[PDB]
Amino acid sequence: ADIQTERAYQKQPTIFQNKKRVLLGETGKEKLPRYYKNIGLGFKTPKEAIEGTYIDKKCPFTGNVSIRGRILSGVVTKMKMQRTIVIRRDYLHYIRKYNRFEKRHKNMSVHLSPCFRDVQIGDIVTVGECRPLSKTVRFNVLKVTKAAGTK
Amino acid sequence: MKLNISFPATGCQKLIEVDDERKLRTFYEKRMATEVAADALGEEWKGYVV
Amino acid sequence: GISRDNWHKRRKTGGKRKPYHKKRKYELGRPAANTKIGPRRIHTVRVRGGNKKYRALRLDVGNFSWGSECCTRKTRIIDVVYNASNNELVRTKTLVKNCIVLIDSTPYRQWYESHYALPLGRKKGAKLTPEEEEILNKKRSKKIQKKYDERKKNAKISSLLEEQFQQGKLLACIASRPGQCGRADGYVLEGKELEFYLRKIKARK
Amino acid sequence: ARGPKKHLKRVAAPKHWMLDKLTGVFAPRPSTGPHKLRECLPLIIFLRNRLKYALTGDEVKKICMQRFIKIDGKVRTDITYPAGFMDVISIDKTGENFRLIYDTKGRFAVHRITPEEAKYKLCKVRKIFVGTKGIPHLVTHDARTIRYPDPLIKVNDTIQIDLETGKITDFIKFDTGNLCMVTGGANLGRIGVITNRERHPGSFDVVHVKDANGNSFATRLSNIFVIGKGNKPWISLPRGKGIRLTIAEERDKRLAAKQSSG
RNA sequence: AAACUGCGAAUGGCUCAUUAAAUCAGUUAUGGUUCCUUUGGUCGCUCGUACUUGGAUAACUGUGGUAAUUCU
RNA sequence: UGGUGACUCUAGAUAACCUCGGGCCGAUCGCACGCCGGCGGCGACGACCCAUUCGAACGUCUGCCCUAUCAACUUUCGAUGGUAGUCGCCGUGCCUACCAUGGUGACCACGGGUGACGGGGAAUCAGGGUUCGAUUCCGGAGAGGGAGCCUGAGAAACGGCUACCACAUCCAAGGAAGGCAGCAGGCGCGCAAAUU
RNA sequence: CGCUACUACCGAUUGGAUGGUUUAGUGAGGCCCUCGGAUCGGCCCCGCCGGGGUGCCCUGGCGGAGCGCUGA
Numbered sequence A: 001a002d003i004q005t006e007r008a009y010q011k012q013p014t015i016f017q018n019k020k021r022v023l024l025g026e027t028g029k030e031k032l033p034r035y036y037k038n039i040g041l042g043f044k045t046p047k048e049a050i051e052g053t054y055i056d057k058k059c060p061f062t063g064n065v066s067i068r069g070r071i072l073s074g075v076v077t078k079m080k081m082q083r084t085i086v087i088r089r090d091y092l093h094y095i096r097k098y099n100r101f102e103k104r105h106k107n108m109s110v111h112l113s114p115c116f117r118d119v120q121i122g123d124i125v126t127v128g129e130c131r132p133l134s135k136t137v138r139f140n141v142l143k144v145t146k147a148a149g150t151k
Numbered sequence B: 001m002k003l004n005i006s007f008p009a010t011g012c013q014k015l016i017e018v019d020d021e022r023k024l025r026t027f028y029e030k031r032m033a034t035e036v037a038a039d040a041l042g043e044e045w046k047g048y049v050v
Numbered sequence C: 001g002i003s004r005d006n007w008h009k010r011r012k013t014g015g016k017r018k019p020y021h022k023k024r025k026y027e028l029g030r031p032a033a034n035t036k037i038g039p040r041r042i043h044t045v046r047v048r049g050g051n052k053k054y055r056a057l058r059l060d061v062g063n064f065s066w067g068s069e070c071c072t073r074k075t076r077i078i079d080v081v082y083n084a085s086n087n088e089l090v091r092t093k094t095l096v097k098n099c100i101v102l103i104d105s106t107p108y109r110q111w112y113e114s115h116y117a118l119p120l121g122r123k124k125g126a127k128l129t130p131e132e133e134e135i136l137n138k139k140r141s142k143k144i145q146k147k148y149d150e151r152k153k154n155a156k157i158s159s160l161l162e163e164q165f166q167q168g169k170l171l172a173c174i175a176s177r178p179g180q181c182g183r184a185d186g187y188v189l190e191g192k193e194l195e196f197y198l199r200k201i202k203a204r205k
Numbered sequence D: 001a002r003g004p005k006k007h008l009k010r011v012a013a014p015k016h017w018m019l020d021k022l023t024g025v026f027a028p029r030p031s032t033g034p035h036k037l038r039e040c041l042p043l044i045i046f047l048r049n050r051l052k053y054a055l056t057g058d059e060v061k062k063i064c065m066q067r068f069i070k071i072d073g074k075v076r077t078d079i080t081y082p083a084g085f086m087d088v089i090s091i092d093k094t095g096e097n098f099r100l101i102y103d104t105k106g107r108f109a110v111h112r113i114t115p116e117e118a119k120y121k122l123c124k125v126r127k128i129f130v131g132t133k134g135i136p137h138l139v140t141h142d143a144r145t146i147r148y149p150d151p152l153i154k155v156n157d158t159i160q161i162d163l164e165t166g167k168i169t170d171f172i173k174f175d176t177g178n179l180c181m182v183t184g185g186a187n188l189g190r191i192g193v194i195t196n197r198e199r200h201p202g203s204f205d206v207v208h209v210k211d212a213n214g215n216s217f218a219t220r221l222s223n224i225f226v227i228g229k230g231n232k233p234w235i236s237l238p239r240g241k242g243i244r245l246t247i248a249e250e251r252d253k254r255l256a257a258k259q260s261s262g
Numbered sequence E: 001a002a003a004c005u006g007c008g009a010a011u012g013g014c015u016c017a018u019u020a021a022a023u024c025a026g027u028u029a030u031g032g033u034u035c036c037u038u039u040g041g042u043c044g045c046u047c048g049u050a051c052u053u054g055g056a057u058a059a060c061u062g063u064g065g066u067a068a069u070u071c072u
Numbered sequence F: 001u002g003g004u005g006a007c008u009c010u011a012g013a014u015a016a017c018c019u020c021g022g023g024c025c026g027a028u029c030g031c032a033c034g035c036c037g038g039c040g041g042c043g044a045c046g047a048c049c050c051a052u053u054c055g056a057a058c059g060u061c062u063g064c065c066c067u068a069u070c071a072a073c074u075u076u077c078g079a080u081g082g083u084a085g086u087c088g089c090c091g092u093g094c095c096u097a098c099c100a101u102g103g104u105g106a107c108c109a110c111g112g113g114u115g116a117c118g119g120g121g122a123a124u125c126a127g128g129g130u131u132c133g134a135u136u137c138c139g140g141a142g143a144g145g146g147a148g149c150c151u152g153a154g155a156a157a158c159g160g161c162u163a164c165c166a167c168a169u170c171c172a173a174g175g176a177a178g179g180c181a182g183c184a185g186g187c188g189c190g191c192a193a194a195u196u
Numbered sequence G: 001c002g003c004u005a006c007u008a009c010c011g012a013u014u015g016g017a018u019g020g021u022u023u024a025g026u027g028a029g030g031c032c033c034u035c036g037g038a039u040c041g042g043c044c045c046c047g048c049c050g051g052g053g054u055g056c057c058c059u060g061g062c063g064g065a066g067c068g069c070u071g072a
Helices: B021-027 C106-115 C142-152 C159-167 C191-204 D043-050 D057-065 D247-260
Strands: A071-081 A084-095 A100-111 A124-129 A139-145 B002-007 B012-017 C041-046 C052-058 C061-066 C071-082 C100-104 C169-174 C186-188 D069-071 D088-091 D096-102 D108-113 D120-131 D135-140 D158-162 D167-172 D179-182 D191-198 D206-210 D216-220 D224-228
Touching: A071 A100, A084 A124, A100 A124, C061 C100, C061 C169, C071 C106, C071 C169, C071 C191, C100 C191, C159 C169, C159 C191, C169 C191, D043 D057, D043 D069, D043 D108, D096 D179, D120 D224, D158 D224, D167 D224, D179 D206, D191 D224
Parallel strands: A100 A139, C061 C186
Antiparallel strands: A071 A084, A071 A124, A084 A100, A124 A139, B002 B012, C041 C052, C061 C071, C071 C100, C100 C169, C169 C186, D069 D088, D088 D096, D096 D108, D120 D135, D120 D158, D158 D167, D179 D191, D179 D224, D191 D206, D206 D216
16 A cells, blocks of 8 residues: 655655654654644544545645635546546526426536545535636535445 | 047047048948047047047 | 646637637746756846746755754755656756755764764774864863763664765755745655655666 | 726716716726725715815815815825725814714715714724734724734724724624624615624624614624624714614605604 | 926727637635735844945037938 | 634744845935934835735636537547646646546537627517617727737736738838827728718 | 520539638747857056155056956
């Protein structure tokens, strides 16, 4: 489970990992301090974020992003990108002339932190608005709700 | 060609029109801000540097 | 000129984009500051709002930090050995952020001598240079030697750090952007970061 | 486009200036100042359109350049100077002082005050921050930075400052039961007692206010300006006491006044 | 009066060619930026010729060049 | 110290650095005549930096006309994402290198057309709708067509500059000077629109 | 079906008309030449007597050059 899989060293920029230790008081890797924050609006930090080891600069809990703006929801449809998933948001648009609605949808590419493991296609995810993380990504997954049709 | 000579010590200037090429030959092929001994312009210009 | 706008880019669906205006001044880009190693030459560029950016073109001196000991000194930059973005940024020796550089160890070594109270380390070949052994042996009172001993109690330098200090060079990372601030600062590599970058350089060579 | 605009079309001007459309194409574009463009009152509007002391903008310029107008105790020669909520306008030559207070219809009333009450004003604080060697600071709705404020003064409270010295004299905490004024929105100009505040994290808070006659309304927290402790005001209220009358009672009062007075 | 300096000339006015999630409208964010001016306005917080320092250059005076310019 | 729903916020502390193209902590003016080599009151103008005053810029949550005789589109040329940088005022494939194959579509993608600037809004009232909106307010764009810049806080400015393209003015033929979709006025075009 | 009131498609046509729509080359340009630097500049080694903290030497106009020193 190597973390350093890139050409540059991966580490949380806040945590200093070169502090001097004591020889007689150290036997094995003692601890690596973990940087994590609690995002607002009542969202609880997942356990895997606090006690994990992954490095994600776009993670809402262990990264540099701040959640602000719209809190949305959607269902996972594709998981074929690194730390990024595609969710679909279905809604009904009212046509005034016919007094009726039509089904419409929009796909949003949202960032999924490694603190959410075993997220499946069809799960309901709560996303929060953040700064542009890529060309199309502007939302971060904050909570994953398992689908009713799951194990 | 005409020559616009000035004497900064007195602040006096005089434009003398000369059409005499051999008097101008001493200035040819010399860039600005170069000091040239101007004795060929006239018999009264002896010992003059312009 | 060079533009940083996004409306020249294909849409997320892949469709073509038709511009509604021509290039604006606030969307401009500027040529890179390929900050080589050499005598200090920094050009100043005026930016939006009247502020100033320092476009460093040549640098051989930087303010690097020894994080574990919290000892940052002005040091000379000797070489670049690793770039995590492009190999040609090492071959052409440009100073950019997060690039691994060789720096002198003389200021940190001298501060360590001012720290030195450790037992016999690496003093085999000796130096025999007078007026230098004052900073190691000196004449000192009892409580001053007691303080130096209590400092020696907590002196511990990694073997890789020692091996670098023997050669007179240290591995460091540029934590500043020389093409934007004119300064090539950073910190000396230590610990697992040092091990990782040593493996990277070894595998590259 | 290409830098800031310097004009204001007369029909794009704030509607509470009560400007008419046939006078000209332009309205006096208020200069930058302690109050926002859409919730200020340019000195020319007050001196000409309200007080009728001047007939044209040139006469307003003459009055202002004679150094007769003082806003918050300072002589202001700018005829488009933005004067706003709780600002004190003192004209010494004619010996009258005005306080810019919204009337119940959302417009700046000509509210005359005694010269004793013209020596202070109420300022809602916008932020408190610490800077420059641990020195607390305080920013008001009036864009005034007051150093070394009382540690009990927090955001959304209103302080009372003496105009001559520019120092905090007293303050009122933001709490239920305190009298308040609405400075924006549909309920702008209304005065009542704060009854309940609903907090919406990440969004705007809602404050519920009740009048003296029991009418209850609500507005966003940014629109609340607490006037006094409890139900008594620290400043003098306009001819209407912040009560908004329905159009039926307005018409009834107008008809009764027409009947009684001949 | 001239001329140097400062400021404005990026507002206003005109037109609708381009432009089909582009522009725009309502909503929200900048905790991801800059901001002349206005208004408050850190402005003896640095620990070894100050009773006022220095190349200049316009206007002005004179010599001019070009068929010609708000050229010089 | 003090805040926010949430800071890698603010404040504090130690080690240092601080740009040829340096960096803030003042080398100046205002008619009254006044005080126990000296002090003083009002101002004006500057100037770092903090305060969203005016903004600008960037985020696409939702909403836009006709067309399938347009069904698949994007990925030597970034196409979607990740990592590290460059550049930028800043977030970002914005650009570069490496890595992973993604991303969008019959809930109309992509392509084409529009006698398409968008909106506030305008033309009958049964109710519902159908058309229109170049046009005085708001937003955008452009200054013959492109492109590139200087100055500046702010312009890719055109009653600023520099080129090329198309027109076009004076010339002594060496050269010089242009941009009315500003107000008026001309010509042309026209069914179609005013006073130098 | 031997008359006209009756543009386009097909044109053994490539005869023509504001027609830039992309390859491949060339190529404008704020000269951001790190190869460039006769000119322009208070000491730099002097002419010499402007005059001093000593009509007696830390001097107030470089007359005046030398790819030697530095400066946009």
